[PDB]
Amino acid sequence: MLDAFAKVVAQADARGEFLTNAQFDALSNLVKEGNKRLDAVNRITSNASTIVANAARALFAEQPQLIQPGGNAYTNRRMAACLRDMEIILRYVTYAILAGDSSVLDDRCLNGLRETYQALGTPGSSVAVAIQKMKDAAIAIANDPNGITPGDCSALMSEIAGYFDRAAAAVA
């Protein structure tokens, strides 16, 4: 996998180039913004069980078909699998947030997932709805102004939304 710094290096290396002042500046800015990124990861991780549970409870309230006998989340084995997938997706999104790059999410989680669900008969559209609900909950938790030194994390929130949106698109 790549983080944000590794990604710039990799691009440089393929050109055979040293970095430019602009590229150094960009990386230095990433470092300058690092405490915010650490806070987002900590907050989301610290709330992971509720983010998942609450999104699952909401999905099944809105999409009762999934928990009727014959539905894809019926039986405890299928419900446990569904809950696990929600935890997995959220785990890999948080890795992407720490890294400042989507590569770990794409490579270790999203690649092949659409095909996995199609072979199983799991409805990827409904997965996308569970991801969106975790996204909204995660962002509200990461961006809560209470109990933190005040500042603007809007760019980071947009980046975090991106990662969730990418997961949703990969399964939908």
């Binding site: 790549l2 290096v9 440089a12 040293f18 150094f24 990386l27 900590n42 785990r91 890294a99």
Partner: protein, 162 residues
């Protein structure tokens, strides 16, 4: 690519776990050290040409035969001189990359993996490159923790060639 951030993620992912504070502390350490590391990277980059030029000459002074001996593995032709300058510049670019990435990963992937094979197959002496690196370390002009950063990656390359 091995960086403090990818090592942190990899640890959490091997264990099937969310990141914990154990990993977040590690990344914070990276972020704080990046101050010194970026200072080193910029300095080495800005002075790259003179360091490369001086390093090549350090090699030729230590090993005079490399300027006269017949064979395509030696710097006794314009092409061999150009290959050598190229290679020294590769080592220095990799050091800058390690400094930017906060770890050895760029050097490991782009230079160290297969190094021993290349040196053997093409009859290149590791001692040539060790000399170049020792010149860079002696003459980069850095001080304080920026120097400590640069030297850690230069010495890592030297160890890889020893």
């Amino acid at each position: 690519m091995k960086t403090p951030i990818t090592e942190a993620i990899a640890a959490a992912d091997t264990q099937g776990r969310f990141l914990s504070n154990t990993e977040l502390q590690a990344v914070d350490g990276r972020f704080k050290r990046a101050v010194a590391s970026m200072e080193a990277a910029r300095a080495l980059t800005n002075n790259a040409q003179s360091l490369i030029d001086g390093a090549a000459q350090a090699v030729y002074q230590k090993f005079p035969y490399t300027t006269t001996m017949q064979g395509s593995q030696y710097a006794s032709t314009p092409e061999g001189k150009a290959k050598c300058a190229r290679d020294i510049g590769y080592y220095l670019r990799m050091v800058t990359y390690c400094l930017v990435a906060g770890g050895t990963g760029p050097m490991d992937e782009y230079l160290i993996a297969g190094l021993s094979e290349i040196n053997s197959t093409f009859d290149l002496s590791p001692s040539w490159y060790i000399e170049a690196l020792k010149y860079i370390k002696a003459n980069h002009g850095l001080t304080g923790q920026a120097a400590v950063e640069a030297n850690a990656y230069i010495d890592y390359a030297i160890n890889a060639l020893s």
